[PDB]
């Protein structure tokens, strides 16, 4: 019996309500407050230059056609009431394939205050494009954006605003980080304007700033390559009588660098420019290939100009370790400072 | 005022017959298409397809939707598109396409006082284009996109690009990781099927592959190993330790290069240009290694002739390899 009063109120609002017209059509501009709660920041894929994010996307506007009076000032209604009224057609400009979860029911809420103000939130999983500049891989950083706005209403009809100060209108859950290798340092919230072939639209933007963590690549790639190079220079200290032994060092060391280079090539995303890792492998490849050449030269002069052959080995015991030490100083100081 | 617009809109949709195209049983209705490309990505050689995202707009006039008294371009909710007549435009070479539906179905409907209707959609179509990988990676691919009406012939519907060559916008902002869009072209023509003749609009891109990193990553390691294998010819056989090390390292390294690339490239019947060079380099480094094993077995027997073999091999390998390289490049460039 108590619900009968609320049944009349709901049936009174929807009577004569045409949901095909935005509020204040041809009279003013519909203002839509917006804020986002990031429940979890999903993994970032370098192979596809995309990322995933789950949001409690909230919207709020004013519709004078839904004013009422009753026992309760707020009508916490069901998500099926949303389809009966007008709602913004907000989409994501750089979204690739987003999902609006509807398990076990459509994840939407609708609340109508007594003065017509509406609150209409939903749970989304947006996968967005994020262009990446991988010149300084794996010591690189990015700023993945997230742009959303109206699809059919120009900026003279619908304008989007943040509910609070732009810094505090996007909140990230403390435990939501699902990033394996990246590290979310912070986010920036901004607003902008776009001008398509149909008109001018208001675009709300938010950039998430990510810096990759170098820990994995030091263990997998950098340290084994350095050990292999240091292993290569061991051949210089062996006495000249163990000629067959030095042959093993030259052949196996070169072959080892092939395995590391190929295995580390899989982690390299498909690009058309030389990354920072490629320079390190290319230089380390030269040192190993230089040792084999050096051993070839000494073995060539041996038993023909033995005095000259021993002179090469004395210098090689110093030149090779010194240059590889200098190269590390130049390589790391150049990239780590950026 | 607000009720007036509702009255006007309901007046139009009362008696509107969705099953009948505008000017049914009369002149064909002209439809103009604008495409605003958003991104092109994943140009897969294995699947012979590319992924294209765009804004797809269509313009046409429906005399039944003309209204008067409201000097504004009505922009109705996208759910009204289920009650109007819209062209049945499809893409012939499309494999798997969808219209984005977050937060709502990405769709636009605009009416005009004279009846002109703008109907926009945001589509991510995975079109198909076969590629001739004979000259890979020194090849160009001409990937297209077909647009055609399904159920209406040229007696009912007519297509035309809106704005001439300016109908398609946003091609320059595309930055493919491995390709480079040299040019795009727009074509309008008719297609004759067994059930009639249908209009068709064709948008085609000509992609030229970037060879900037293929040369460095592939050809230089092949050439350096091939040249490195020649050094064994100038080394006297008394210093046979170097020759064994050079011979074993080169072939094994060359073998790894040839095997690794095949497992990381698309698989096809024809012999790609990249396979010819790897096969050529592998044969040359294999003969050099086999050359040493021939001399080593025989130099104890006839050291006069055995040592003379390396003297000529210092000419045969550099001469033949240069000649092979000259034929290859002038045949594949």
């Amino acid at each position, epitope marked *: 019996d108590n619900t009968t009063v609320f049944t009349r109120i709901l049936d009174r609002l929807l009577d004569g309500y045409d949901n095909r017209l935005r509020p204040g059509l041809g009279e003013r501009v519909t203002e839509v407050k917006t804020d986002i709660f990031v429940t979890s920041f999903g993994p970032v894929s370098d192979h596809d230059m995309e990322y995933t994010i789950d949001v409690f996307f909230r919207q709020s506007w004013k519709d004078e056609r839904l004013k009422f009076k009753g026992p309760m000032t707020v009508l916490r209604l069901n998500n099926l009431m949303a389809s009966k009224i007008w709602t913004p057609d907000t989409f994501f400009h750089n979204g690739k394939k987003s999902v609006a979860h509807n398990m076990t029911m459509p994840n939407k809420l609708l609340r109508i205050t007594e003065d017509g103000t509406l609150l209409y939130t939903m749970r989304l999983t947006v996968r967005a494009e994020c262009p990446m*500049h991988l010149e300084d891989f794996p010591m690189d950083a990015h700023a993945c954006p997230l742009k959303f706005g109206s699809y059919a209403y120009t900026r003279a009809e619908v304008v989007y605003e943040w509910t609070r100060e732009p810094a505090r209108s996007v909140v990230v859950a403390e435990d939501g980080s699902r990033l394996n290798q990246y590290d979310l340092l912070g986010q920036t919230v*901004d*607003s902008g304007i776009v001008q398509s072939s149909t008109g001018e639209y208001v675009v709300m933007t938010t950039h998430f*700033h990510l810096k990759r963590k170098i820990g994995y690549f030091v263990i997998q790639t950098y340290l084994p390559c350095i050990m292999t190079v240091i292993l290569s220079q061991v051949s210089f200290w062996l006495n000249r009588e163990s000629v067959p032994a030095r042959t093993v060092f030259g052949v196996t060391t070169v072959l080892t660098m092939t395995t590391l280079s190929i295995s580390a090539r899989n982690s390299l995303p498909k690009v058309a420019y030389a990354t920072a890792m490629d320079w390190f492998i290319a230089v380390c490849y030269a040192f190993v290939f230089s040792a084999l050449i050096e051993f070839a030269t000494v073995n060539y002069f041996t038993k023909s100009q033995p005095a000259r052959a021993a002179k090469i080995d004395r210098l090689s015991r110093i030149a090779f370790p010194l240059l590889f030490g200098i190269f590390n100083l130049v390589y790391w100081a150049t990239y780590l400072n950026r | 005022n607000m009720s007036f617009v509702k009255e006007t809109v309901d007046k139009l949709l009362k008696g509107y017959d969705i099953r009948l195209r505008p000017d049914f049983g009369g002149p064909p209705v002209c439809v103009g298409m604008n495409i605003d490309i958003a991104s092109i990505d994943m140009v897969s050689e294995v699947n012979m397809d590319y992924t294209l995202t765009m804004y797809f707009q269509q313009y046409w006039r429906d005399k039944r939707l003309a209204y008067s008294g409201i000097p504004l371009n009505l922009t109705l909710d996208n759910r009204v598109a289920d009650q109007l007549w819209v062209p049945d435009t499809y893409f012939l070479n499309d494999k798997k396409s969808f219209v984005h539906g977050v937060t709502v179905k990405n769709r636009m409907i605009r009416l005009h006082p004279d009846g002109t209707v703008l109907y926009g959609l945001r589509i991510t179509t995975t079109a198909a284009c076969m590629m001739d990988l004979r000259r890979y990676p020194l090849d160009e691919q001409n990937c297209t996109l077909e647009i055609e009406s399904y159920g209406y012939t040229t007696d009912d519907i007519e297509f035309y690009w809106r704005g001439g060559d300016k109908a398609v916008t946003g091609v320059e*902002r595309i930055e493919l990781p491995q390709f480079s869009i040299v040019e795009h072209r727009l074509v309008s023509r008719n297609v004759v099927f067994a059930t009639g003749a249908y209009p068709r609009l064709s948008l085609s891109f000509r992609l030229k592959r970037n060879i900037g990193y293929f040369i460095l990553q592939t050809y230089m390691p092949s050439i350096l190993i091939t040249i490195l294998s020649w050094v064994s010819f100038w080394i006297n056989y008394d210093a046979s330790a170097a020759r064994v090390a050079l011979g074993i390292t080169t072939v094994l390294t060359m073998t790894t290069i040839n095997t690794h690339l095949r497992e990381t490239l698309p698989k096809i019947p024809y012999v790609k240009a990249i396979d010819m060079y790897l096969m050529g380099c592998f044969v040359f480094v294999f003969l050099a290694l086999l050359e040493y094993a021939f001399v080593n077995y025989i130099f104890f027997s006839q050291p006069a002739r055995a040592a003379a073999i390396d003297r000529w091999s210092r000419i045969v390998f550099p001469f033949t390899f240069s000649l092979f390289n000259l034929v290859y490049w002038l045949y594949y460039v």
Partner: nanobody
Amino acid sequence: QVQLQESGGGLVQAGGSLRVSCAASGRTFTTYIMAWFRQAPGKEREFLAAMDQGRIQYYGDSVRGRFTISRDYAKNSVDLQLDGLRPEDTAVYYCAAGAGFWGLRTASSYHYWGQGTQVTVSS
């Protein structure tokens, strides 16, 4: 070597259009963000406008509704239309390009920079 050369500008009197243009060379800035910075004499360097790959236009709070930025991706260049110029607009205008790490309104986020172009408004 990547260079950002500018042109346009000059002397204008109490408003009126004055277009300032910037052209890049040596690198394709299709995927970067090309912005515009104004540096009044001795005060500081101020953000004016920016445009990323998606043609999204950002503006400062003091030039909103007056200036207009418009890239030309084919020619790898960016322009900036000035309208209703004021005496306070007399400054040197700079051309920047970068990825906008830690925001796009911060000069520290733009690695590449232009030489500059003096713009003076008469009174």
